[PDB]
Amino acid sequence: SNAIAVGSERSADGKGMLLANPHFPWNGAMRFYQMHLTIPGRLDVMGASLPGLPVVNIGFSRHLAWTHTVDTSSHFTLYRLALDPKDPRRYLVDGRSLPLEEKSVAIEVRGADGKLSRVEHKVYQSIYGPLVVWPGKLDWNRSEAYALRDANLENTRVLQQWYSINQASDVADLRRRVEALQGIPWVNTLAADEQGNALYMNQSVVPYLKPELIPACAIPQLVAEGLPALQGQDSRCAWSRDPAAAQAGITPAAQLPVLLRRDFVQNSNDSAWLTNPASPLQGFSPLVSQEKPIGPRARYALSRLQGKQPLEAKTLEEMVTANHVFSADQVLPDLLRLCRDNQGEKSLARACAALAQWDRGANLDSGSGFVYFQRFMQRFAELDGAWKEPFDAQRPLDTPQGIALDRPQVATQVRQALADAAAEVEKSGIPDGARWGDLQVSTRGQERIAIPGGDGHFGVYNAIQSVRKGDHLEVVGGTSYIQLVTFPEEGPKARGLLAFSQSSDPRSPHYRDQTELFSRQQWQTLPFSDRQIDADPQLQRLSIRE
Amino acid sequence: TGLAADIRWTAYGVPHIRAKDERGLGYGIGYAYARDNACLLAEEIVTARGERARYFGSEGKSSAELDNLPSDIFYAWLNQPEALQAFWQAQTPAVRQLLEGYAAGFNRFLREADGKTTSCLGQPWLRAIATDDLLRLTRRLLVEGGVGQFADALVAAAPPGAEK
Numbered sequence: 132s133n134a135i136a137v138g139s140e141r142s143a144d145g146k147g148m149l150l151a152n153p154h155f156p157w158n159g160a161m162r163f164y165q166m167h168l169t170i171p172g173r174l175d176v177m178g179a180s181l182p183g184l185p186v187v188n189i190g191f192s193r194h195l196a197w198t199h200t201v202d203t204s205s206h207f208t209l210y211r212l213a214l215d216p217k218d219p220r221r222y223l224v225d226g227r228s229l230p231l232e233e234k235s236v237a238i239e240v241r242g243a244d245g246k247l248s249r250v251e252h253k254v255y256q257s258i259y260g261p262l263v264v265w266p267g268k269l270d271w272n273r274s275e276a277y278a279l280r281d282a283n284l285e286n287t288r289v290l291q292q293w294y295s296i297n298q299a300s301d302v303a304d305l306r307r308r309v310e311a312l313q314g315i316p317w318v319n320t321l322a323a324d325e326q327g328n329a330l331y332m333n334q335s336v337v338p339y340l341k342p343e344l345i346p347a348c349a350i351p352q353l354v355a356e357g358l359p360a361l362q363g364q365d366s367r368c369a370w371s372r373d374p375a376a377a378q379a380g381i382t383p384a385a386q387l388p389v390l391l392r393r394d395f396v397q398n399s400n401d402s403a404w405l406t407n408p409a410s411p412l413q414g415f416s417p418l419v420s421q422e423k424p425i426g427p428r429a430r431y432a433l434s435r436l437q438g439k440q441p442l443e444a445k446t447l448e449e450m451v452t453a454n455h456v457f458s459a460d461q462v463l464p465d466l467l468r469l470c471r472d473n474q475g476e477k478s479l480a481r482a483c484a485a486l487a488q489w490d491r492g493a494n495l496d497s498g499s500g501f502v503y504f505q506r507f508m509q510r511f512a513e514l515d516g517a518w519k520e521p522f523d524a525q526r527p528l529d530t531p532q533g534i535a536l537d538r539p540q541v542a543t544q545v546r547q548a549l550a551d552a553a554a555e556v557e558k559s560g561i562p563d564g565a566r567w568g569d570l571q572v573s574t575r576g577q578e579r580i581a582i583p584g585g586d587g588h589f590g591v592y593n594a595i596q597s598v599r600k601g602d603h604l605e606v607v608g609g610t611s612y613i614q615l616v617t618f619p620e621e622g623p624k625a626r627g628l629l630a631f632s633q634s635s636d637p638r639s640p641h642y643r644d645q646t647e648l649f650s651r652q653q654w655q656t657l658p659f660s661d662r663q664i665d666a667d668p669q670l671q672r673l674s675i676r677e
Numbered sequence: 678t679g680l681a682a683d684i685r686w687t688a689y690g691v692p693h694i695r696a697k698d699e700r701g702l703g704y705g706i707g708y709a710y711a712r713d714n715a716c717l718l719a720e721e722i723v724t725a726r727g728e729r730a731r732y733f734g735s736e737g738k739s740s741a742e743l744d745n746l747p748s749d750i751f752y753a754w755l756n757q758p759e760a761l762q763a764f765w766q767a768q769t770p771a772v773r774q775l776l777e778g779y780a781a782g783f784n785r786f787l788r789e790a791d792g793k794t795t796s797c798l799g800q801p802w803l804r805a806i807a808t809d810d811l812l813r814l815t816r817r818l819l820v821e822g823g824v825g826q827f828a829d830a831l832v833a834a835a836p837p838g839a840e841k
C-alpha cells in the first residue's frame with residue numbers, strides 16, 4: 132500500500148490533501164467495495180470497505196480524508212516453550228510442569244461418493260495460545276515447541292473503531308478517537324484535513340513488553356530475521372500490563388509512533404522511521420518500529436516529495452499513473468554500461484536491445500525491457516556485495532545505488548545473471564514486439580483487459596501483483612481502491628477508481644466498467660454532496676423497508 | 678422490523694445509503710452489497726464458518742489459497758461459539774444494530790434475487806446469513822496479521838512420536 136498526506140505548508144491551495152493507494156487482493160475476503168453512508172445530521176462518510184463490514188474502512192467526510200497501509204509492527208508473539216523432559220505434552224514455566232490443553236473441532240467432509248463424513252482434529256493449546264509447527268524451523272520435538280499469542284484475539288473494539296473513525300471531524304478528532312479506543316488491528320493510519328494538517332499514526336494493537344525485558348526475553352535466533360518471539364519458560368516474559376492501554380497486554384497509545392505535520396507524511400509498508408525524513412521516528416520497541424532500509428516505493432515517493440515546490444492533486448495522481456519502475460534508477464544505468472562493454476556477445480544481444488529501448492515504465496505500451504529487467508533483478512537480489520554503494524544508514528534515501536562493476540567477480544556474476552535472465556525470458560513464448568499490456572491482464576468472463584503497473588518490489592508505486600496463468604500474467608492484487616481528496620470551499624473533491632470494479636459477479640453491469648477505466652488510467656469523480664450525486668446522469672434510487 | 682433505507686446509486690454502481698439509524702443504515706449496506714457480491718460473501722462466510730469441505734470437498738482451496746480441510750479446522754477453532762458470543766457481548770448497541778441491519782438487508786436481496794446479478798443462484802451454500810456470520814468474517818480479518826498467517830502451522834502442530 133501507499134499513502135501520502137499533504138499539509139498547508141506544501142499543498143498548492145494551503146489546505147489538506149490525501150492520496151490513498153492501498154494494495155490489496157482483487158478477489159476474496161479483502162476485496163474493497165465502494166459506498167457512501169449517511170445518517171443525516173450525525174454521519175456522512177464515503178470510501179471503500181472490506182466484505183461484510185457495515186463501516187467505511189478508507190474514505191473521507193466533509194473536512195477529513197483518511198487511509199491505511201499495512202504496518203511493520205508485530206501483532207503477535209511466538210513463545211518458545213521448554214518441554215517437560217519426561218512428557219512432550221507438558222511445558223515448563225518457572226521450572227514447573229504445566230499440561231497442554233486440548234480443544235477438538237469436528238469438520239464435515241464431502242466425499243467422492245457425495246456423502247458427508249466427520250473429521251475430528253485436536254488443537255493443542257498453552258497458556259499463551261495454540262501451538263504452531265513450521266517444519267524445519269519451528270518444530271515440536273522432545274525438547275521444545277512453539278505457541279502463538281495473537282494480540283487481536285481480544286480486540287473486540289475493531290468495528291466500533293472504524294465506526295468512530297467514520298464520525299471523525301478533523302485530524303485532531305481522528306487521532307483522539309483512535310488513541311482512545313486502540314481498536315485498529317494491523318494498519319497504519321494516514322490522514323489530512325481541510326485546515327491543512329497531515330497525520331501519520333502507527334496506532335494498532337501491539338504486544339507490550341517493557342524495554343528492560345527485551346534483551347533476555349527475545350529469542351536471539353528468531354529476532355535477527357524479524358520474527359516476534361519470546362522465551363515461554365519464564366513468567367516474566369508475559370506481555371507487560373499498563374493501565375493506560377485499552378486492552379490488557381497491549382502497547383499504550385502514548386508509546387506508539389505518531390507524526391503530525393503541516394508539510395507531508397507518507398508510508399509504503401516500511402516502518403514509522405522515515406514517514407518524513409525531516410523528523411525521523413526513532414527509539415521505539417522492536418515490536419513497534421525499527422530503523423530498517425526502506426523499500427523502493429517509499430524511496431520513490433520521498434524523491435518526489437522532498438523539496439519546497441507545492442504539491443498539486445495532479446502531482447499525486449501522476450505518481451501512481453506514471454508507472455515508473457523506480458528500482459531501474461538504482462541498477463539500469465550500470466547494467467547498460469555492462470551491456471555496452473559486452474557488445475557482440477550473442478547471448479546478451481536481445482536483452483541489451485530491449486533494456487536500452489525501454490521507457491523504464493510498467494505502462495501498457497512499455498517494451499519487453501521490463502520483463503528482462505524483472506528476471507535480472509530476481510537474480511541480482513541474490514548476489515552478495517554487488518552494490519556500488521551499499522545501504523548507508525546515514526544516507527537512507529540514496530542507498531543502495533549502482534553496480535560494483537569495478538570488482539571483477541561482481542562484473543562476472545552480474546553478466547552471468549543477465550545471461551541467465553535473458554535465457555529464461557527467451558524460453559517463454561513472448562511474441563516479437565509484444566508489450567507489457569499484452570502480458571499482464573485481468574480476466575473478465577471469456578475476455579481479458581490489459582492492466583498497467585508492476586510489482587511493488589520493483590518500486591512501481593502503482594503496485595500490481597500477478598501470477599502465471601496459461602499464456603498470461605493474471606492480476607491477483609495491488610492497486611485497488613484509489614482516492615485522491617482535496618478540500619475546496621464547496622465540499623470535499625474526491626477523485627479515483629475501484630480498479631477491479633464494484634462487482635465480483637460476471638453478470639453484473641459493474642463487473643468491469645471501472646476496470647476498463649483503470650486500464651486507460653482514467654480516474655473519475657467520487658460524488659459526495661447531494662449536488663454531485665444529483666448531477667449524475669446514471670442516478671438510480673430505491674427505497675426499501677421491512 | 679424498523680428497518681428502512683434510501684439507496685441512491687451513481688455511475689459504476691456506487692451506492693449512497695441514507696437512513697435514520699444504524700439498523701436502517703446496515704439494511705441499505707447489506708442490500709446494496711448483496712446485489713453486487715452475494716456469491717463472494719456467501720463463499721467467504723462458508724470459509725469463515727469452516728464449512729468448505731462440507732460443500733466443496735477436501736480437494737480445492739479457499740480464496741486465501743488454503744486447502745479446504747485445514748482452512749476449516751482453523752476457522753472452526755477461531756470461530757467457536759464461545760468466542761463469537763463473547764465478541765457479540767462486547768459490541769456497542771450501535772454496532773449490534775449495524776450488523777443486524779446488514780444481515781437483514783443481505784437476506785432481503787437473497788429472497789428477491791432472480792439471477793440478474795447473481796451467478797450462484799440455486800447453490801446450496803447461497804443461504805440467509807446471521808449476525809454471527811458477520812462476526813465470523815470480522816474475526817477472520819482481525820487475525821490476518823497474526824495467527825491467521827499461521828493457520829497451516831496450527832493445523833500441523835502435533836506432538837512427537839517415538840522417533841530418533
Ligand SMILES: O=c1onc2n1-c1cc(Br)ccc1OC2
Nearest residue numbers: 184188289290293316815818819
Ligand atoms: O474495518 C474492519 O472491521 N473489522 C476489521 N476491519 C478491518 C479493516 C481493514 Br481495511 C483492515 C483490518 C481490519 O481488521 C478487521
